[PDB]
């Protein structure tokens, strides 16, 4: 082996990062050490600010702001689709994007708003493949 | 590609977990949203509780405790070697363990205390290879 010699001196553990991400998603499911509620229209999503910042240019800008870093509730634009945000929040914590014909437009618009560039590029490529 | 078809329905992003871990280590280096000081003898190490819990059976037990989850300072056993803790803290945030002849005993004892089982097993195998 579960480890290898890295390019540098250190031994590297193959599944470390994905196992850490799995444990962070386990904490999220159990509502452990969650420190923010993201409100999208009617819905509320509990999460860890550090995970949101690590996965979004918008959350990175918000939580690096001296004033907003201390907020426990963040309201997103009411035009953001809650299902699209939920798919992207799941992706942040798992590396898996449940992209489908019925949700791809909402996922793309939400990823543009959240500043998740590679997800936007992937959504554009899948849309382009159908036209 | 930077994505593939996963075993399940979802598309999976190959470098997502290690890129998230890199961003969490960037936040740690800049002291952004760190919420705990770990004290080992004289030294102090700032970190994110969620990362410590995701990487240690001891931190998982401490921060799931209703009383200790709210502590901003955690003092480890004064017999814990600060350098060994520093190597393991770096490993938690990077997946890379800087294991060497001069630090392997301290890294192993610290990983046993912190409940990082695979790191203990790896330390034992490297020690066994020299005898
Ligand atoms: C000096 C500072 C200056 C800062 O613009 C950058 N850096 C940075 N440092 C720390 C953090 Cl927490 C951070 N967050 C951050 C910022 C922008 C991001 C993504 C993440 C982000 C993005 C994305 O498109 N953008 C634009 O894609 C969505 C994603 F989930 F796949 C990724 C995850 C895999 C890592 N995260 N970005 C370095
Ligand atoms: C129902 C709950 C019941 C709980 O014992 C388990 N689970 C669990 N859920 C959430 C978390 Cl945050 C968690 N943390 C946790 C607990 C124990 C651990 C490691 C991590 C841990 C360990 C380790 O040996 N142990 C014993 O190795 C050190 C490491 F950095 F490589 C890993 C990192 C790669 C993931 N983390 N463990 C599930
Ligand atoms: Cl708000
Ligand atoms: Cl203490």
From Swiss-Prot, chains A, B:
Changing residue 23 to K: Abolishes interaction with NCOR2 and HDAC2, no effect on interaction with CTBP1 and transcriptional autoinhibition. Induction: Down-regulated during maturation of dendritic cells by selective stimuli such as bacterial lipopolysaccharides (LPS), CD40LG and zymosan. Protein levels decreases upon genotoxic stress in a dose- and time-dependent way. It is found in: Nucleus. Changing residue 118 to A: Abolishes interaction with NCOR2 and HDAC2, no effect on interaction with CTBP1 and transcriptional autoinhibition. Phosphorylated by ATM in response to genotoxic stress. Phosphorylation induces its degradation by ubiquitin/proteasome pathway. Polyubiquitinated. Polyubiquitinated by SCF(FBXO11), leading to its degradation by the proteasome. Ubiquitinated by the SCF(FBXL17) complex, leading to its degradation by the proteasome: ubiquitination by the SCF(FBXL17) complex takes place when aberrant BTB domain dimers are formed. Expressed in germinal center T- and B-cells and in primary immature dendritic cells. Residues 34-101 form the BTB domain. Transmembrane segments: none annotated. It is linked to Chromosomal aberrations involving BCL6 are a cause of B-cell non-Hodgkin lymphomas (B-cell NHL), including diffuse large B-cell lymphoma and follicular lymphoma. Approximately 40% of diffuse large B-cell lymphomas and 5 to 10% of follicular lymphomas are associated with chromosomal translocations that deregulate expression of BCL6 by juxtaposing heterologous promoters to the BCL6 coding domain. Translocation t(3;14)(q27;q32). Translocation t(3;22)(q27;q11) with immunoglobulin gene regions. Translocation t(3;7)(q27;p12) with IKZF1 gene 5'non-coding region. The BTB domain mediates homodimerization. Its dimer interface mediates peptide binding such as to corepressors BCOR and NCOR2. Interaction with corepressors through the BTB domain is needed to facilitate the rapid proliferation and survival of GC B-cells but is not involved in the T(FH) formation and BCL6-mediated suppression of T(H)2 and T(H)17 differentiationrequired for GC formation. Homodimer. Interacts (via BTB domain) with the corepressors BCOR, NCOR1 and SMRT/NCOR2; the interactions are direct. Forms preferably ternary complexes with BCOR and SMRT/NCOR2 on target gene promoters but, on enhancer elements, interacts with SMRT/NCOR2 and HDAC3 to repress proximal gene expression. Interacts with histone deacetylases HDAC2, HDAC5 and HDAC9 (via the catalytic domain). Interacts with ZBTB7 and BCL6B. Interacts with SCF(FBXO11) complex; the interaction is independent of phosphorylation and promotes ubiquitination. Transcriptional repressor mainly required for germinal center (GC) formation and antibody affinity maturation which has different mechanisms of action specific to the lineage and biological functions. Forms complexes with different corepressors and histone deacetylases to repress the transcriptional expression of different subsets of target genes. Represses its target genes by binding directly to the DNA sequence 5'-TTCCTAGAA-3' (BCL6-binding site) or indirectly by repressing the transcriptional activity of transcription factors. This is B-cell lymphoma 6 protein. It comes from Homo sapiens. The chain holds residues 5 to 129 of 706 of the full protein.
